[PDB]
Amino acid sequence: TDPMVSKGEELFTGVVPILVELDGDVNGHKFSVSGEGEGDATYGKLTLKFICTTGKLPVPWPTLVTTLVLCFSRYPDHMKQHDFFKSAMPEGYVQERTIFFKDDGNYKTRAEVKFEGDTLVNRIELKGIDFKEDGNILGHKLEYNYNSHNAYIMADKQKNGIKSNFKIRHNIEDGSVQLADHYQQNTPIGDGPVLLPDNHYLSTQSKLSKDPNEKRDHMVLLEFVTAAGIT
Questions:
Q1: What three-state secondary structure class fits 7?
Q2: Quick one: CA torsion of 208, 214, 216, 222, rounded to 10 degrees?
Q3: Which of 29, 57, 124, 167 could lock onto 52 through a cystine, CB 3.0 to 4.6 A?
Q4: 3-class secondary-structure state, position 2
Q5: Is 120 helix (H, G, I), strand (E, B) or coil?
Q6: Cβ atoms < 10 Å from Cβ of 113
Q7: Distance CA 148, CA 168 (A)
Q8: What is the CATH classification number for the domain harbouring 134?
Q9: Total structural domains in the chain?
Q10: Which domain holds residue 145?
């Protein structure tokens, strides 16, 4: 048994409550999102409901899925020595992205993921610029659904963290695709040791739904993430 692995797995045993808080500004359209739910890392499983607390969300909900807790990914036993995300807990990590929407604007995000008591918290600031006010994002032309992806993870040694660059494809309501190229870096909040991984990937699937009794602008997310790519 690896005591560093045991430390991360004791934090994630059972069902862990999750809170997500985001403040955003996309082309000057300001908004806030609050999310709540629970994660069960044993099954790589997340269940979350997000509400736009400022009114109407000015971008499509699917474009925020990746921004809105990879510590809940299921790392196979033979790969648990590569789980940076849990190793940084409870002190947590910073997760930063630039997301380039092809032929449109970009989001830049900075988030802190850490425990507050029993609750795993994801606090995010999002800034979007250069969007077309008639494009697929500000024009709300994206279907309310989500595809399955693979995100390759690499060590980022001089940040004592990880980096990743992956593609997200959003279905457009005309049948086409809006690509969102993601560039990501994570770095620990604490000063203790973390697990720096060999190259691997995270395999994701997500299902978006609506709460039939909810009249606020919202998104229900069921998401599974599993690490793979190491023999």
A1: helix
A2: -20
A3: 57
A4: coil
A5: strand
A6: 23
A7: 8
A8: 2.40.155.10
A9: 1
A10: 3-228
